[PDB]
Amino acid sequence: TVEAKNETFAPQHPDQYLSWKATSEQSERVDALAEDPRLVILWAGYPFSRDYNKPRGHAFAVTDVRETLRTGAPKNAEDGPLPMACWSCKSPDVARLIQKDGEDGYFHGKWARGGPEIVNNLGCADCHNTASPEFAKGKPELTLSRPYAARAMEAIGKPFEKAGRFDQQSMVCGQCHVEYYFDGKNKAVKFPWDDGMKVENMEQYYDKIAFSDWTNSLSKTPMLKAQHPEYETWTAGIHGKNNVTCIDCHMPKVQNAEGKLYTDHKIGNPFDNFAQTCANCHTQDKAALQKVVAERKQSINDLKIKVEDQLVHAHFEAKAALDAGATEAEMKPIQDDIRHAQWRWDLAIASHGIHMHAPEEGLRMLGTAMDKAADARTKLARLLATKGITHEIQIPDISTKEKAQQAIGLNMEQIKAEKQDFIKTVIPQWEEQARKNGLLS
Amino acid sequence: TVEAKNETFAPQHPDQYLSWKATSEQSERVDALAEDPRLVILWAGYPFSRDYNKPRGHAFAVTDVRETLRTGAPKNAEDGPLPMACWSCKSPDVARLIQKDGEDGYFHGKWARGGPEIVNNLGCADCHNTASPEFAKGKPELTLSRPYAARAMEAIGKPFEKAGRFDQQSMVCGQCHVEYYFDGKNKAVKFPWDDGMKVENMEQYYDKIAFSDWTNSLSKTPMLKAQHPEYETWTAGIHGKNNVTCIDCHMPKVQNAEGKLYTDHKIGNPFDNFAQTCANCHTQDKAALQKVVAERKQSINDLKIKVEDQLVHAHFEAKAALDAGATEAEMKPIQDDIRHAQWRWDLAIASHGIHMHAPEEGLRMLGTAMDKAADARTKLARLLATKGITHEIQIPDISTKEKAQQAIGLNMEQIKAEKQDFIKTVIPQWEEQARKNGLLS
Ligand code: HEC
Ligand code: HEC
Ligand code: HEC
Ligand code: HEC
Ligand code: HEC
Ligand code: HEC
Ligand code: HEC
Ligand code: HEC
Ligand code: HEC
Ligand code: HEC
Ligand SMILES: [Ca+2]
Ligand SMILES: [Ca+2]
Ligand SMILES: [Ca+2]
Ligand SMILES: [Ca+2]
Questions:
Q1: Which of A247, A292, B93, B353 could form a disulfide with B118 if both were Cys (CB 3.0 to 4.6 A apart)?
Q2: Phi, psi of A377, deg, nearest 5
Q3: Which CATH code is given to the segment(s) A268-410?
């Protein structure tokens, strides 16, 4: 009953369809590793050290998951580094497959397998019960199309079916804009919300299940990776506490040419229509509010860099200790400190909207990160001393993404060449096959 | 022209006088060192390590400056640890003496010299031009009675006489509720605002003039002491950015029995009259706003303790390094880090209102503190190593105020006994002299 072919809905819902399509205008893709090469060091051993960009329009979700170095260059349906779960927050064909094959059936196997199947842009069936007769009437009929997100909302005491309209508005966004990890042997998406959504809760959660995303290749620390915790951090901030919904800012009610009200589906920066977003609740002018938000961004950026610098030193200092013959027992307390420091930093800044949604919480989290970084480096200086090393550990030149990637042993020329081959040759075949199978226009 | 005898105004301005007097109800004097023994270590070698309480009602300003161990037990007008400047933010007799003796003359002398002269409670002439014929008519005629405060407001580009009513309201409070230091041979009160009011501005200011408040007796670090930066931090926070004045929250307009409006002079906790404070601008329930403010208090407290724990270790590790033979040159970089780390911590939490006035700014400052503390301790571990020490430096038992004070070499029994003698013997003599000379009663 899932209709992943979004254009099916264009005749009946032109205003929503046209604005939805318009996120294709949000096309600039900012390379975050180029901007901040420290990230390559922090994520050494993990695919984020190869390729990490800031988000752009929803229209690009399928493209970007296909093009990122993180998904590699699979040669067949059982090849490639990543599992099916990488599709989960990119396309309504995910809802289609979960319905068709069941949740476990969907998650089984490799990302490559989904290539000729997950082909429609993030769209109507991701957020709407389009099968309801009320939908054609122009009623939204919001729904959670993602069972793992439904379970998560229940876990935090906010079951979707019991939630009011305004709670539901943010929850649809909360199907994807969250911290997650891959759970069990099928690598199913799970939001680590069992103990609560605060950084401390999630840290306790992951430690109790002895989970790690990867081992940092420099320090051998069993690491946790944070991802875009918008739902969690929005909940923590002033707007979320007042149930100012994601939609209030990102999907304002606007008028069509005929003066009819509809929800603007061109999901982007709220400051691009300040008059219909912030101005709904605030008397301050646009420049005044922009300056405040920019101020928080700078405050957080400055502290974020300080934490990252401390962590860069910590990873290289851990490397020096290992290279000097440090044992597993000797390294363990240091690795615990690095893991916790970096977890707190990563959850703090992994959402590019933190300085807006919950600046005070971002700053708090960074402070607690810094505490554990201090511990790591102090433990390390003593351990290194016991090996006869009493000088400051020198760091290689990591002033550029290229240098940082070189330093951690990536062959970026080759990795990029192989991906480019994959993009040019495999993607068109995937699209051709989906068309032949009637999954794609 | 200054009338320091507040009761003079009782018949003319009963509603203001009676509510002003009622801060005597805010009488709990909470021992901050008892609640947080870490403070004794951080302030080791400074009077705050002896006695530091949370603020109470304005009515207690004179008694509290008299009774604190910080001002000691002077035997005569030329004795005691502190200068005349400690009276400055405590009583309208200060305004009287500045007029009578000039500002320079007022500041010249030890604190003990002012004892028989500075006897009336913080009051009308501190905030009002009581000599103005308009004041007798019920007009506030707000004034800056403190020249050093007028100069500071000028230094931040806000000359009082050009400021509007709303700006002036907070400036009156900003005569005392600020970070300050003692300047020159006369030890005049000066606000370190010449380069701006941000922690970074003040830090650079104090470093440029190579100023220090004391030398920490453990680490031998040339330290800076922060004090109650409400004006600076209020300015940084969301309320200050919107010119929500100190008065809007702490001195609301209320009605008397006859239904006539007056300004409530019982300056205390805004939540005591939520209906006429926050509820004028906010639609949220009292309990909802209390819960948010309490959450920020906890967030800041948690991080505050983490920074203090790091600084406690840093001071004792510095002590260990000095004990191991570290030279002045070897210690300098470490002491630079300790100085900066502690300055940032102290300014962050020296205001008991920070979690309300500017929580994000308090949190930010603490993060920057933690950066420099990490640096201090890492440097220390390497230095200690060069002296043949590679183990963690153990800390004495500081689980209570009494233990911490013992640990840093204070004879608290002696100090308290000497102060009790002074309080019981000298204070009545001061009051008798003041009454004799028509200053009191
Ligand atoms: C499996 C490990 C993957 C891979 C390879 C990708 N995703 Fe996601 N994704 C989600 C959201 C909300 C965003 C935008 C917000 C943000 O990025 O901060 C993204 C973005 C991306 C991109 C574009 C940015 C980039 O990293 O270069 C790419 C290439 C990408 N993803 C690949 C949401 C989710 C999930 C919600 C639970 C899940 C699961 C994933 N993504 C998984 C993956
Ligand atoms: C989440 C990322 C969504 C996508 C993808 C689509 N829609 Fe949407 N829609 C969404 C929200 C949060 C809302 C507002 C609900 C509310 O409580 O106000 C809507 C609204 C609609 C409506 C109702 C009419 C209106 O308010 O404009 C319709 C008919 C609608 N949306 C249609 C629609 C179409 C055709 C989509 C694919 C092109 C589509 N939506 C995607 C959330 C999301
Ligand atoms: C999973 C199906 C998602 C749902 C439901 C929502 N979002 Fe999303 N968003 C998602 C991805 C994978 C991306 C990145 C796309 C890319 O190719 O980079 C985004 C991006 C955004 C952005 C950034 C837009 C830009 O930079 O131009 C915003 C502001 C955003 N998303 C907000 C948002 C809102 C408010 C949602 C509920 C209505 C929502 N998203 C749902 C994935 C998914
Ligand atoms: C106003 C009170 C908002 C609410 C509620 C939500 N968002 Fe937001 N978000 C808002 C602004 C003004 C900005 C940009 C800040 C800037 O410096 O310009 C953002 C940012 C995001 C992003 C980052 C997008 C990017 O291009 O980097 C995302 C992914 C995002 N917002 C999503 C999001 C979600 C999922 C929300 C509900 C949980 C949500 N936002 C609420 C304004 C507001
Ligand atoms: C109502 C639906 C709102 C919209 C749209 C925006 N804001 Fe908001 N804001 C709102 C409330 C109810 C509050 C709490 C204060 C109160 O009135 O009780 C706020 C608060 C802020 C703040 C201060 C808190 C913070 O998180 O820093 C800022 C800086 C702020 N709002 C900015 C802002 C911006 C930039 C918006 C458009 C992107 C915006 N708000 C929309 C209510 C609502
Ligand atoms: C204005 C620039 C001041 C100067 C100069 C001094 N003090 Fe002060 N004091 C001031 C304020 C605004 C407050 C309340 C806010 C707070 O956080 O404390 C105080 C409080 C006191 C107290 C009561 C609390 C305590 O510390 O136990 C005492 C005993 C006190 N002040 C003493 C004191 C001394 C000895 C001074 C000279 C070094 C001194 N004060 C100067 C404002 C100002
Ligand atoms: C600062 C700590 C003050 C003290 C001490 C005293 N007053 Fe006050 N007063 C203060 C302010 C900030 C205001 C409000 C001014 C405004 O802009 O609204 C006032 C107000 C008055 C007034 C005006 C009438 C009114 O609003 O109630 C009068 C007549 C007055 N105050 C008298 C007064 C008396 C008699 C005092 C000593 C007992 C006194 N004030 C102390 C600031 C401060
Ligand atoms: C110096 C002459 C001051 C002026 C002018 C203002 N304040 Fe004050 N305040 C001052 C001191 C020395 C103290 C501590 C008194 C003690 O003995 O502990 C205070 C205290 C406060 C408090 C705390 C009250 C309590 O805890 O019960 C508050 C909330 C406060 N002050 C606010 C305040 C306001 C709003 C002012 C402008 C109208 C103001 N103060 C002026 C010193 C001085
Ligand atoms: C509302 C927007 C306020 C503004 C403007 C000012 N203050 Fe405030 N302050 C407010 C509250 C609700 C509280 C108590 C917080 C709590 O946890 O209950 C405070 C606290 C203070 C304190 C500390 C008092 C204490 O007893 O520890 C002081 C000294 C203080 N406030 C003074 C002060 C000054 C000088 C202001 C203008 C520069 C100011 N406040 C503004 C609420 C609000
Ligand atoms: C009008 C003169 C106000 C009074 C009285 C109080 N607040 Fe306020 N608040 C006001 C504004 C203009 C804003 C900015 C948001 C906006 O609407 O533009 C706020 C914001 C807050 C916030 C969020 C920001 C923050 O500093 O954390 C909180 C938590 C808040 N206000 C609480 C609060 C309390 C507890 C008050 C009484 C002691 C209070 N406000 C009074 C305006 C005004
Ligand atoms: Ca973007
Ligand atoms: Ca994760
Ligand atoms: Ca108090
Ligand atoms: Ca000071």
A1: B93
A2: -70, -35
A3: 1.20.140.10
CA distance A205 to A227: 16
Secondary element (H or E) of residue B189: strand B188-190
Annotated binding site of B for heme c: 58, 86, 89-90, 124, 127-128, 173, 176-177, 239, 246, 249-250, 265, 278, 281-282, 357
Right CATH for A1-267+411-441 from 1.10.10.60, 2.40.160.20, 1.10.1130.10, 3.20.20.80? 1.10.1130.10
Name the token pair of A108. 């089984």
**Whole-number Cα distances in Å, A422 to A66, A78, A419, A426, B31:** 9, 15, 5, 5, 69
Q: Which two tokens stand for residue B280?
A: 């004028």
N- to C-terminal Cα separation, chain B: 18
Resolution for the entry shown, Å: 1.7
CB-based contacts of A168, cutoff 8 Å, min separation 6: A142, A160
Place of tokens 């911290």: A179
Solving technique: X-ray
Q: Where in chain B are all domains bearing CATH 1.10.1130.10?
A: 1-267+411-441
Cβ(A318)–Cβ(A331) under 8 Å? yes
Identify the residues whose C-beta falls under 6 Å from ligand 1: A 52-53, 55, 64-65, 68, 70-71, 82, 85-86, 88-89, 176-178, 180, 189, 228, 352
- Contacts with A, B 166-205, CB within 8 Å: none
Sign of CA dihedral A123, A126, A131, A133: negative
B188, β-bridge pairs: B183
